[PDB]
Design an enzyme around this catalytic site. Sequence first.
Site, mmCIF file in Angstrom:
data_model
loop_
_atom_site.group_PDB
_atom_site.id
_atom_site.type_symbol
_atom_site.label_atom_id
_atom_site.label_comp_id
_atom_site.label_asym_id
_atom_site.label_seq_id
_atom_site.Cartn_x
_atom_site.Cartn_y
_atom_site.Cartn_z
ATOM 1 N N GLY A 1 0.726 -1.545 -0.330
ATOM 2 C CA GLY A 1 -0.083 0.089 0.069
ATOM 3 C C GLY A 1 1.339 1.684 -0.303
ATOM 4 N N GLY B 1 0.304 6.095 -1.028
ATOM 5 C CA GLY B 1 -0.312 7.247 -1.406
ATOM 6 C C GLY B 1 -1.187 7.232 -0.585
ATOM 7 N N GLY C 1 -4.474 1.808 1.699
ATOM 8 C CA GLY C 1 -4.785 0.600 2.612
ATOM 9 C C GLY C 1 -3.745 0.116 4.272
ATOM 10 N N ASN D 1 14.010 6.714 2.184
ATOM 11 C CA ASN D 1 13.828 6.972 0.594
ATOM 12 C C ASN D 1 14.968 6.846 -0.449
ATOM 13 O OD1 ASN D 1 11.427 8.414 1.673
ATOM 14 N ND2 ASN D 1 12.295 9.515 2.370
ATOM 15 N N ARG E 1 16.069 7.861 -3.550
ATOM 16 C CA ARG E 1 15.760 8.412 -4.263
ATOM 17 C C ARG E 1 16.313 9.948 -3.524
ATOM 18 N NH1 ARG E 1 10.672 10.704 -2.897
ATOM 19 N NH2 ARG E 1 9.454 9.162 -2.597
#
Length: 496
Positions: free
Chosen positions: A216, A218, A221, A340, A342
């Site tokens: 899940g 954004g 979930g 993260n 990125r």
Amino acid sequence: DLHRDFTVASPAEFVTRFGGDRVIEKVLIANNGIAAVKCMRSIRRWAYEMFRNERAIRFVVMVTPEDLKANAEYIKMADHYVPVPGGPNNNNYANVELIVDIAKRIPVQAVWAGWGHASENPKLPELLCKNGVAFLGPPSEAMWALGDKIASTVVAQTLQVPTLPWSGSGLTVEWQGKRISVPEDVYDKGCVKDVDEGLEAAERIGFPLMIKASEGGGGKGIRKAESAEDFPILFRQVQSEIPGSPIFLMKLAQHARHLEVQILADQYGNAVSLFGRDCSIQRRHQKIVEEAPATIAPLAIFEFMEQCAIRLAKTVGYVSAGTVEYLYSQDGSFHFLELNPRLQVEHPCTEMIADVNLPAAQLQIAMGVPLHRLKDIRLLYGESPWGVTPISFETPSNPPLARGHVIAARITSSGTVQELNFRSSKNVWGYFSVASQFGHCFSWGENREEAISNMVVALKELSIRGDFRTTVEYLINLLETESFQNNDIDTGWLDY
Ligand SMILES: CO[C@H]1CCCC[C@@H](c2ccccc2)OC(=O)[C@@H](C)[C@@]2(O)O[C@H]([C@@H](C)[C@H](O)[C@H]2OC)[C@@H](C)/C=C/[C@H]1OC
């Protein structure tokens, strides 16, 4: 004075004269908007500094029918562009197989995805690698090993980094090279397959707690349980929303601050921290106000957080730029939240206080250039601009210091971007993207107070315009509160 500037004739000479192994002269950008403009702009400046040719590294961008129709700025900026299907991002920017096919057909030697879309999908670097195409990010093996929230938390515990109480607490992996991995049998022990065991794990974890489905994201979930009585309903609501997905439980972050440590690693196991940022002021999973560096925690504790972030990166064989988020509590304790894999839209705050060109660092790193051979990194560590002498990031002789302070704010009212310039302060930059919608403002100052002041002034200037004649008024009130101004620990209420 530019007399000491060293330059080479081309990407090939750069790679050979700097200990790299792969030549990259053409990059495919799997993104649009501010991300694409930022990427091209940052690397081009580096190309000017190293080759005296801003376009030494050519760029190809992916364009949707909509963007091309609104004549997005990023399109005209690119050396070449490739029209792609419109509609949701799964039909274009986030389509891993599409990105790869394009990268091979052009062909390019590397791909940059930025943030959002497919930038966190391990299958991208995986598929690129299999086709001889570099990725300006961590390798799939580095994302498969760090895995999701479950995997990384388990990994953090193995490296003895504090974590929040969760259904996986206590789990560790058995731990020359060879990055760490999480056995499927260990992973499952961190998940809850049913309401019954879910209730047993929730009893020891304590309420309030979060029921989350790893697949899940954004706001999907996820569900917050306040009592053992509501647990069942909530747990099943999560199952219904993202059926077939593993589910774990985690104690809810009470009244804590959110600190992030910027990380940069090469392809040889070296990694360094680029100070960090403070993103405590959030509005329902949304970073509203960010600061760099972080100052709410004592320098010695924060340096420990940096040390943990680096160990976590090295152990999993991380490569490129990344962020490790920590939870800092009112007392003085901290816990690992997530990593993260990125760059984020707010990386410029870090670039400014560390004088490091992140996107250019990413490109050179993917060329095989070691950390100690990166100009910006050498200067940060007080070494010669073009020396080959390895640097001891562990115990440096010239303690790297952060230059000034930065405040970044999210502002609200496609690929079209609008650069915001202010007549007030020349130390503030901004942008926003029409659907209108949002953007970000960035403010620098010799210290925290001047950075906040510059921001307030530029925001007052924005209010004068029609688009932000109200939506930015709450930020000005927030920035000028006593508790914020005095840099207090207890500012969770600024969320309102
Ligand atoms: C979309 O392009 C914008 C992006 C501006 C981002 C914010 C700005 C800033 C940060 C904090 C406070 C105020 C302003 O950051 C900067 O200017 C600095 C840190 C930085 O990003 O500049 C870019 C690079 C040399 C490098 O990546 C980095 O230098 C180390 C150059 C190419 C300028 C690009 C701009 O084009 C006009």
